[PDB]
């Protein structure tokens, strides 16, 4: 292991102040420009719109254009300019640090896996929610695909087992993963019709492709809202907050490009312009940065440290999503 934050210290501890409980939704394939709050023509986040204390960040650029590249970068100490995907798994990352400091780290995954981020931590702290052995919400559609909201079931059990400790829960979404956007949401979210249902996306009618994509965002709006509602059930005992950031965007036919994964050197803007949301309860004292702050995935690690009152010199200078 190559360390970067052996100096990290937690300035206040959960025996001397309210324990802190944070959900970090690690999003998938969502584009900033399809978010209502960023000026999109459709109301793709109706439920998040009803919740007080949500900040939408309108200028966030991902570290890369794929899950394998972006996800380790989101938790890295090195920042986009120095990040090396090929050695990321041997670097101390922000979850390693928080775990060393006693913060209970949980990682539930309805996407693939943590792309190496959790590899140094006990395997019991990672749970596969793509399978009904863990996920109780899979038989709600014709494909029997486990839904992101199932990652919230049994979270009370985890909180009860970590009573009084600081907790950081990562929920790795299936989200808007393509090509089969139409599979990504239950029928209650099929608001925009007709929808593309083919694997050759260039052969779908463009509007029908957009419709499937936007319906998948409605299901993610629901999942994020439900995550906040779950946190709210613990707000008297815990200082609760929710961070959402997508791993990358998506091309939807611009210049004949589909899906993602374009190398950064020529990646179109749509693959790197991602949404970010931050919610916190009024008791926590956490203050969001300005909604239009120029931000990147580099802001994630200092945000997670600040949420737990941790300082590490490697990122002391670094802009976060919060003050």
- Write out the residues near Au ion by the rule CB under 5 A: 28, 67, 247
Smaller CB distance to Au ion: residue 28 or 239?
28
Phi-psi region of 215 (alpha: psi -120 to 50; beta: other; left: phi over 0): alpha
Smaller CB distance to Au ion: residue 250 or 281?
250
Compute the least distance from the CB of residue 126 to Au ion, in Å.
18
**Phi and psi dihedrals of 254, rounded to 5?**
-60, 125
247 appears as a binding residue in the annotation: yes
Given a contact cutoff of 8 angstroms between Cβ atoms, the answer to whether 259 and 178 are in contact is yes
Smaller CB distance to Au ion: residue 28 or 222?
28
Alpha helices in 241-318 (DSSP H): 300-307
If you ran DSSP here, which 8-state letter would residue 4 be given?
A: S
Compute the least distance from the CB of residue 259 to Au ion, in Å.
10
Smaller CB distance to Au ion: residue 53 or 179?
179
Compute the least distance from the CB of residue 115 to Au ion, in Å.
9
Other CB atoms within 10 Å distance of the CB of residue 202: 11
Smaller CB distance to Au ion: residue 284 or 296?
296
Q: Please give the C-alpha separations between residue 116 and each of 67, 86, 108, 125, 130, in angstroms, as whole numbers.
A: 11, 11, 14, 13, 18
70: which strand partners? Answer: none
Compute the least distance from the CB of residue 248 to Au ion, in Å.
5
Smaller CB distance to Au ion: residue 93 or 280?
93
Name residues whose C-beta falls within 8 Å of residue 86's C-beta, 6 or more positions apart in sequence.
none
**Phi and psi dihedrals of 252, rounded to 5?**
-130, 45
Compute the least distance from the CB of residue 90 to Au ion, in Å.
22
Compute the least distance from the CB of residue 249 to Au ion, in Å.
9
Closest-by-Cβ residue to Au ion is: 67
Compute the least distance from the CB of residue 111 to Au ion, in Å.
7
Report the run of H or E that residue 126 belongs to, with start and end.
Answer: strand 126-128
Separation of alpha carbons 249 and 246, rounded Å? 7
Separation of alpha carbons 241 and 193, rounded Å? 35
4 appears as a binding residue in the annotation: no
Smaller CB distance to Au ion: residue 71 or 101?
71
Separation of alpha carbons 307 and 310, rounded Å? 8
- Cα angle vertex 192, ends 190, 195, to 5°? 80
Binding-site members for Zn(2+) are 28, 67, 247-248
Binding-site members are 28, 67, 247-248
């Amino acid at each position: 292991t190559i360390y970067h934050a052996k100096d990290a210290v937690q300035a206040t501890k959960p025996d001397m102040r309210k324990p802190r409980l944070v959900v970090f939704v690690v999003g998938e394939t969502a584009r900033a420009d399809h978010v209502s709050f960023n000026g999109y023509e459709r109301d793709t986040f109706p439920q998040l719109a009803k919740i007080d204390g949500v900040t939408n960040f309108s200028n966030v650029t991902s570290c890369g254009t794929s899950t394998a590249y972006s996800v380790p970068c989101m938790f890295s100490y090195l920042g986009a300019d120095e990040y090396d995907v090929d050695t990321a798994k041997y670097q101390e990352n922000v979850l390693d640090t928080l775990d060393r400091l006693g913060v209970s780290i949980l990682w539930r995954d309805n996407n693939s896996d943590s792309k190496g981020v959790m590899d140094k931590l006990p395997k019991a702290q990672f749970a596969d929610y793509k399978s009904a052995t863990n996920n109780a919400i899979c038989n709600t559609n014709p494909y029997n695909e486990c839904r992101d909201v199932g990652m919230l079931v049994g979270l009370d059990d985890f909180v009860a087992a970590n009573n009084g400790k600081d907790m950081l829960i990562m929920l790795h979404q299936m989200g808007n993963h393509g090509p089969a956007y139409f599979k990504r949401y239950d029928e209650k979210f099929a608001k925009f019709t007709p929808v593309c249902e083919g694997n050759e996306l260039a052969k779908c009618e463009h509007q029908s492709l957009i419709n499937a994509y936007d319906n998948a965002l409605l299901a993610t709006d629901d999942f994020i809202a439900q995550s906040i509602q779950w946190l709210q059930t613990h707000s008297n005992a815990y200082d609760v907050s929710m961070l959402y950031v997508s791993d990358h965007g998506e091309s939807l036919g611009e210049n004949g490009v589909y899906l993602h994964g374009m190398p950064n050197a020529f990646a179109p803007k749509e693959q790197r312009s991602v949404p970010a949301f931050f919610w916190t309860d009024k008791q926590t004292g956490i203050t969001p940065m300005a909604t239009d702050t120029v931000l990147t995935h580099d802001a994630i690690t200092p945000t997670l440290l600040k949420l737990f009152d941790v300082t590490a010199d490697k990122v002391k200078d670094r802009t976060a999503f919060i003050r």
